[PDB]
Amino acid sequence: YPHNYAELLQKSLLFYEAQRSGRLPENSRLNWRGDSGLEDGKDVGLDLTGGWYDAGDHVKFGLPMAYSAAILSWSVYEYRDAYKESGQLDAALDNIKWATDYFLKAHTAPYELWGQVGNGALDHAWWGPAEVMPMKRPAYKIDAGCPGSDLAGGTAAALASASIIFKPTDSSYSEKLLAHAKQLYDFADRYRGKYSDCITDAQQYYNSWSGYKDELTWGAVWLYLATEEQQYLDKALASVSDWGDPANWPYRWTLSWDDVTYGAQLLLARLTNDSRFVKSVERNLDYWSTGYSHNGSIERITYTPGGLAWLEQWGSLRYASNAAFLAFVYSDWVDTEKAKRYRDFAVRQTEYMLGDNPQQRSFVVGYGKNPPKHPHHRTAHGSWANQMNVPENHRHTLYGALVGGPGRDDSYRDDITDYASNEVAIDYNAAFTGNVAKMFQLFGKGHVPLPDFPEKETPEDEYFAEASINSSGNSYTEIRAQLNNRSGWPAKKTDQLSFRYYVDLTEAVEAGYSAEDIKVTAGYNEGASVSELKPHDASKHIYYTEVSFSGVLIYPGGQSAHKKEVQFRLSAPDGTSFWNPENDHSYQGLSHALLKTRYIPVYDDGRLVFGHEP
Numbered sequence: 001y002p003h004n005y006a007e008l009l010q011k012s013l014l015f016y017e018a019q020r021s022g023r024l025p026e027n028s029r030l031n032w033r034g035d036s037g038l039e040d041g042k043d044v045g046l047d048l049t050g051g052w053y054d055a056g057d058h059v060k061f062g063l064p065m066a067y068s069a070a071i072l073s074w075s076v077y078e079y080r081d082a083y084k085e086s087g088q089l090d091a092a093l094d095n096i097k098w099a100t101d102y103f104l105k106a107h108t109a110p111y112e113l114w115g116q117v118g119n120g121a122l123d124h125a126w127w128g129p130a131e132v133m134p135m136k137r138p139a140y141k142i143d144a145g146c147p148g149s150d151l152a153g154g155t156a157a158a159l160a161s162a163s164i165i166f167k168p169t170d171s172s173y174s175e176k177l178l179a180h181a182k183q184l185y186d187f188a189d190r191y192r193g194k195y196s197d198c199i200t201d202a203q204q205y206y207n208s209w210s211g212y213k214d215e216l217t218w219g220a221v222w223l224y225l226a227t228e229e230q231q232y233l234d235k236a237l238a239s240v241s242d243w244g245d246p247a248n249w250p251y252r253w254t255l256s257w258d259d260v261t262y263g264a265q266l267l268l269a270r271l272t273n274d275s276r277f278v279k280s281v282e283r284n285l286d287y288w289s290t291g292y293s294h295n296g297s298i299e300r301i302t303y304t305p306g307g308l309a310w311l312e313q314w315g316s317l318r319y320a321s322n323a324a325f326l327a328f329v330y331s332d333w334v335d336t337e338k339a340k341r342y343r344d345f346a347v348r349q350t351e352y353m354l355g356d357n358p359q360q361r362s363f364v365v366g367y368g369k370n371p372p373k374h375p376h377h378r379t380a381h382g383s384w385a386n387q388m389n390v391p392e393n394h395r396h397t398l399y400g401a402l403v404g405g406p407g408r409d410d411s412y413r414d415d416i417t418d419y420a421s422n423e424v425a426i427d428y429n430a431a432f433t434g435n436v437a438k439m440f441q442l443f444g445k446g447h448v449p450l451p452d453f454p455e456k457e458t459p460e461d462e463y464f465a466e467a468s469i470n471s472s473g474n475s476y477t478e479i480r481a482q483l484n485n486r487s488g489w490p491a492k493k494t495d496q497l498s499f500r501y502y503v504d505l506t507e508a509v510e511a512g513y514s515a516e517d518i519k520v521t522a523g524y525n526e527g528a529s530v531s532e533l534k535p536h537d538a539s540k541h542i543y544y545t546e547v548s549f550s551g552v553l554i555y556p557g558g559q560s561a562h563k564k565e566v567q568f569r570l571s572a573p574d575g576t577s578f579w580n581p582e583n584d585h586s587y588q589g590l591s592h593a594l595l596k597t598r599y600i601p602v603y604d605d606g607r608l609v610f611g612h613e614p
């Protein structure tokens with residue numbers, strides 16, 4: 001595949017745009033995304049709309065969201081020129097601002113931080129697009145009486161790092177970001193505890209495995225980078241004495257949404273040259289790359305036979321990407337032999353997930369050779385039926401998403417249900433996006449992004465009636481109809497859907513009868529009103545019945561949710577024999593089997609959205 005790292009960077013940022021919750025801007029690039037989560041915060045009296053969905057679900061998990069914004073801002077801080085020359089800087093700022101705007105909303109009071117919207121069990125029990133979520137979406141906070149030093153520190157780091165990269169183009173927004181970062185850090189430092197002991201739902205999805213000591217250091221050093229005030233460097237260095245004996249600092253994991261030790265110590269190593277941080281950074285990157293020498297033995301992470309540095313079963317590519325990013329940053333800082341080894345490690349790991357692997361395929365949706373087609377992602381899939389296997393192929397392309405990827409033997413399945421292979425998440429793409437920026441800097445000379453991209457997707461049929469003839473006679477026709485909302489471009493809730501069923505009364509008028517003599521009556525009925533005949537074209541004796549499910553919510557969210565049924569009969573007076581359905585517009589092609597028909601037009605709030613009128 002002929003790699004284009006400007007296009008890749010453009011796509012990775014487009015994944016974050018696909019993750020947006022809230023009210024979307026008019027110039028949104030993704031026509032298959034619409035407004036969603038508009039009631040977020042209403043249970044607690046607050047506007048908590050916006051931010052990112054975490055993954056293929058619709059929970060806004062504060063700890064990985066803060067981490068993702070912080071790492072995204074970190075790469076803009078390190079590689080601004082790469083973002084600039086690839087044409088992606090405006091997009092990178094716009095996409096980070098979506099998350100930091102949400103943190104500002106969530107940070108309502110100096111010592112209060114909304115850290116989740118959405119309940120994991122309620123959210124994940126339902127498989128459908130964001131715009132038509134039917135369930136309650138409770139909001140959860142930390143505060144001084146139930147704190148969260150990890151969540152609060154990690155969010156302070158996101159605001160502090162973002163404040164740096166926003167200062168050149170929007171200094172008043174930068175000042176606001178920095179003022180909230182200082183308050184959140186004081187919150188984190190003064191009111192100590194793991195946020196998942198207070199937003200207990202988070203224990204089941206984003207548990208604070210490592211505790212908060214790492215976020216305390218991470219927040220303080222980002223505040224130092226963002227202010228150059230010595231007090232923050234001292235606080236960072238003081239917080240490191242709670243890491244204990246430097247000889248026992250962990251080195252067998254990597255930078256991750258839960259453990260930012262690896263980011264903090266790398267930033268402190270550059271600021272201090274203190275051998276405690278240098279050695280700990282090098283133990284970690286040695287372990288990930290050529291092996292960590294005890295002089296006795298060499299200790300090294302598992303590698304797949306295809307060359308992927310393999311931490312564990314879930315989000316394997318995310319881990320190798322996270323490590324590659326630390327390796328790139330270290331390798332631009334210092335001039336040691338290890339810088340070259342780590343730089344080569346980082347490139348090879350990045351080349352693996354871009355296609356240089358045994359599956360001979362890209363692991364970035366919508367990029368490269370044979371990319372994953374079935375990422376585990378509700379809105380991109382576009383189910384109308386609350387089923388992961390309906391439809392059998394995704395309705396939309398989740399461009400830029402890095403999937404979980406292969407197992408330890410390089411095995412991989414492009415399957416919507418295979419969470420290990422095909423999970424996607426904002427933390428998966430965060431360091432990865434920076435790695436792409438660096439690939440552009442190193443190898444992307446002359447790479448330009450895609451113009452006018454993405455093209456708007458052409459919708460399939462979204463609103464339509466399937467209909468069949470119950471019975472027909474020389475004085476009546478009786479119809480079975482199911483009015484469908486299978487929308488996806490974007491999915492939309494509709495509680496004012498209607499259809500019209502048209503007839504030609506020419507044979508009636510010739511027999512001495514008129515529209516007055518035809519009675520329209522409902523039989524089995526899931527909530528529609530059926531009108532008497534109304535004229536469509538009086539000169540030609542064309543009439544219709546308007547069948548309206550006014551106030552009935554219909555939406556692409558399950559087998560019953562997406563359709564409503566009504567059976568209705570049009571009857572001439574008993575004993576007459578003129579009635580003739582064969583010249584009736586909406587009778588055309590109907591059979592005794594329920595089938596979509598283009599001749600029963602469908603209206604939403606009075607607006608024609610499907611089908612043909614006479």
Ligand SMILES: OC[C@H]1O[C@@H](O[C@H]2[C@H](O)[C@@H](O)[C@H](O[C@H]3[C@H](O)[C@@H](O)[C@H](O)O[C@@H]3CO)O[C@@H]2CO)[C@H](O)[C@@H](O)[C@@H]1O
Binds near residue numbers: 314
């Ligand atoms: O406690 C010290 C030990 O730490 C180990 O690293 C842990 C990280 O600190 C922790 O953040 C990570 O949490 C993972 C979690 O295990 C996983 O289930 C979830 O999906 O992602 C989290 C974030 O990546 O767990 C690791 C491993 O336990 C060191 O590896 C170890 O050497 C050290 O003793």
Ligand SMILES: [Ca+2]
Binds near residue numbers: 208210211214258260
């Ligand atoms: Ca932590």
Ligand SMILES: [Ca+2]
Binds near residue numbers: 506581583
């Ligand atoms: Ca007729």
Ligand SMILES: [Cl-]
Binds near residue numbers: 559560
């Ligand atoms: Cl349903």
Ligand code: NA
Binds near residue numbers: 373392393394
């Ligand atoms: Na497919």
